[PDB]
C-alpha cells in the first residue's frame, strides 16, 4: 500500500505502478481503495519502485473530498490533507472533508478537518474526533461509534490539533482505538487535552450540513475551463476483462492526460484537470475500454472491502460477491419500479468493517462463508450506525429480506426519505442513538 494524500497520483507514477502490478505480482491488477490510495497484491523492487517515481509506502493515508462543488476548495483543502501526512510521518485515520460531500466517510475516522470557507477561501477546520467501525462478533464491549465535535480552529493551528490529537490516542489507548479511549475518560476530558497540547481552545462549531458520500459519476465542471472525468470502477479493481480493457484503457489515458488521477474513497478514479477540448480524446479511450459503462445508480452507491482471496482475516466473501449481489439488488430495485433510486449498500468480509457497512444504510458483515449480519437504518450521509436486524444469514435469506423491505419502501417512502430512514419511521429497525450503549440489542 502506498503513502498517497487526498488520492493525488501524477500520470508518470500511474504509468510506473501499472507496469509493476502486470510484471511483478500474482494477481496483476491494481486495486484502489477506500482511503484514496492502490494496492498491488502477491508480490513476486517494489519500495525501489515507488521511491523511483517519488511515491512512499499507526497513522492511515489522510483522505481528503476529491471532487468538492465549490471546486476552488480543493487546492487548498488538498495542500493541508498532505500538510497533516507529512506532520504525521514518524492505527490512526485522517480526514479533511468539504462541505456538503461526505465521500470520505468522516464517522469511519479518529480524527476529521472539516473545511470551513470564508469567500470562497479556506479559513479553519471543524475537528471531529473518534469515528470507528471494528467490532468483534458478539462483544457488546466493542462497537463502531461515530466522530464528536470538539469545536472549531482557524488554519494556523491544523498540524499542531492534529499532533496533539494523535498523540493525547497514542499515549491514553489502552480497546486502544480512539473512540473507545473517548468514551472511556470523556468527550470533555480528551478535548481538553488536546487544547492542552495544542495550546488552543476551540471555538463553537461552524455552520456544516453533507449531503451525499457518492462520487459524481461522468464529466464535471472544475474551475477555469477544466473538467474532470469519474469513472465508476467496480471493486476498484483494475484489470483487463474480456470486452473491457480497463487496465489498458487507464494507462492510454495516462499517457495523453495533462492533469494528474484522484483516487476516490469509493474506489473509483477521477481523471482530473481535462482541458474542454481534450475531453472527446479522453472519453473515447474510457468508453472503448469499458470504463464508462452504465450501471444503476444503486451499483454506483454500493461497496465491498478486500476479503477473499487475499485477506488473511476474511469470513465472507466481499469483494468476489459484490457484483453478482448487486446484480441481485437491480433485479429488485427494478421489480419495485425503483430502478432510479440507491441505497447506500456496502459488503464487509469481516466484523473489522473495511468495507465500512457499519455506516451503510444496508451494511452486510461478513460471519462465515456465505453467511453476513444484516444491519439496517444508516442513512444517506453516513452519520448514524446500522443496527443488526438479522444475524448470520445466507444470501437467499437477504435478498427475501431486502425484496419485502425495498418493496414497502417502494410503496410507503415519503418523497425523498432514504431507505435507512425510511427503516427507521416504519419501525422495522430501531435506530442507534448512542452506539457505545446502545448498538447492541
Ligand atoms: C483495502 C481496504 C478495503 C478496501 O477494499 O478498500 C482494507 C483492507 C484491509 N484492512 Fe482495513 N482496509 C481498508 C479500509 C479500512 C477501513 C475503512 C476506512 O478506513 O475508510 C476500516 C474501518 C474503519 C476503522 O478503521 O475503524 C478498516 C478497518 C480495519 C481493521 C480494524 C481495525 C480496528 O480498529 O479494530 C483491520 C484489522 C486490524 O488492523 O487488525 C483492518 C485490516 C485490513 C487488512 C490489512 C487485513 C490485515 O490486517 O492483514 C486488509 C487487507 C486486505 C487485502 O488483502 O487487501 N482494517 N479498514 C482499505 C485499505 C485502506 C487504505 O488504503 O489504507
Ligand atoms: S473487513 Fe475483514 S475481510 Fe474485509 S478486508 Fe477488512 S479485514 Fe479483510
Ligand atoms: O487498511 S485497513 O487495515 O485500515
Ligand atoms: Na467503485
Known amino acids: 500500500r502506498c503513502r498517497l494524500p487526498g488520492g493525488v ?5 500511474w504509468q510506473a505502478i501499472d507496469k509493476f502490478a502486470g510484471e511483478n505480482t500474482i494477481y496483476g491488477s491494481i486495486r484502489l481503495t477506500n482511503r484514496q490510495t492502490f494496492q498491488f497484491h502477491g508480490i513476486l523492487p517494489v519500495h525501489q519502485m515507488l521511491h523511483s517515481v517519488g511515491l512512499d509506502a499507526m497513522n492511515r493515508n489522510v483522505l481528503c473530498t476529491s471532487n468538492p462543488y465549490e471546486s476552488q476548495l480543493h487546492a487548498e483543502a488538498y495542500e493541508w490533507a498532505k500538510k497533516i501526512s507529512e506532520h504525521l510521518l514518524p492505527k490512526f485515520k485522517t480526514t479533511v472533508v468539504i462541505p456538503p460531500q461526505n465521500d470520505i466517510d468522516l464517522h469511519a475516522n479518529d ?9 470562497g477561501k479556506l479559513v479553519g477546520f471543524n475537528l471531529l474526533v473518534g469515528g470507528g467501525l471494528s467490532i468483534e ?8 461509534r461515530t466522530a464528536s465535535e470538539f469545536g472549531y480552529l482557524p488554519l494556523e493551528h491544523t498540524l499542531a490539533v492534529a499532533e496533539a490529537v494523535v498523540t493525547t490516542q497514542r499515549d491514553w489507548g489502552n480497546n486502544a482505538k480512539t473512540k473507545y479511549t473517548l468514551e472511556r475518560v470523556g468527550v470533555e476530558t ?5 487544547e492542552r497540547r495544542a495550546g488552543i481552545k476551540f471555538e463553537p462549531i461552524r455552520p456544516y450540513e453533507f449531503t451525499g458520500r457518492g462520487d459524481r459519476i461522468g464529466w464535471v465542471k472544475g474551475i477555469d475551463d477544466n473538467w474532470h472525468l469519474t469513472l465508476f470502477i467496480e471493486n476498484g479493481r483494475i484489470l483487463d476483462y474480456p470486452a473491457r480493457p480497463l487496465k489498458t484503457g487507464l494507462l492510454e489515458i495516462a499517457k495523453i492526460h495533462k492533469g494528474d488521477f484522484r483516487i476516490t474513497a469509493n474506489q473509483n478514479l477521477i ?69 432510479d433510486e440507491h441505497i447506500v449498500m456496502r459488503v464487509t468480509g469481516c466484523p473489522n468493517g473495511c468495507g465500512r457497512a457499519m455506516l451503510a444504510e444496508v451494511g452486510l458483515v461478513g460471519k462465515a462463508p456465505g453467511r453476513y449480519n444484516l444491519h439496517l437504518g444508516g442513512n444517506r450521509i453516513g452519520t448514524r450506525i446500522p443496527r443488526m436486524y438479522k444475524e448470520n444469514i445466507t444470501e437467499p435469506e437477504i435478498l427475501a429480506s431486502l425484496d419485502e423491505l425495498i418493496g414497502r419502501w417502494a410503496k410507503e417512502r415519503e418523497a425523498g426519505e432514504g431507505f435507512g430512514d425510511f427503516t427507521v419511521r416504519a419501525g422495522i429497525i ?4 448512542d452506539p457505545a450503549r446502545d448498538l447492541w440489542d
Not at 462478533?137 to 463502531?144: D, L, S
Not at 480528551?190 to 488536546?194: D, G, L, N, Q
Open 9 to 13: 497520483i501524477t500520470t508518470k507514477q
Open 111 to 119: 480524527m476529521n478537518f472539516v473545511a470551513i470557507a470564508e469567500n
Open 137 to 144: 462478533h458478539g462483544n457488546k464491549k466493542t462497537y463502531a
Open 190 to 194: 480528551f478535548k481538553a487535552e488536546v
Open 271 to 339: 481523471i482530473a484537470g481535462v482541458p474542454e477540448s481534450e475531453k472527446a480524446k479522453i472519453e473515447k479511450i474510457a468508453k472503448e475500454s469499458g470504463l464508462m459503462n452504465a450501471v444503476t445508480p444503486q451499483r454506483e452507491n454500493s461497496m465491498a472491502c478486500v476479503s477473499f482471496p487475499t485477506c488473511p482475516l476474511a469470513m465472507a466473501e466481499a469483494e468476489r460477491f459484490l457484483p453478482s449481489f448487486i446484480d441481485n439488488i437491480d433485479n429488485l430495485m427494478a421489480k419495485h419500479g425503483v430502478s
Open 430 to 433: 430501531r435506530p442507534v442513538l
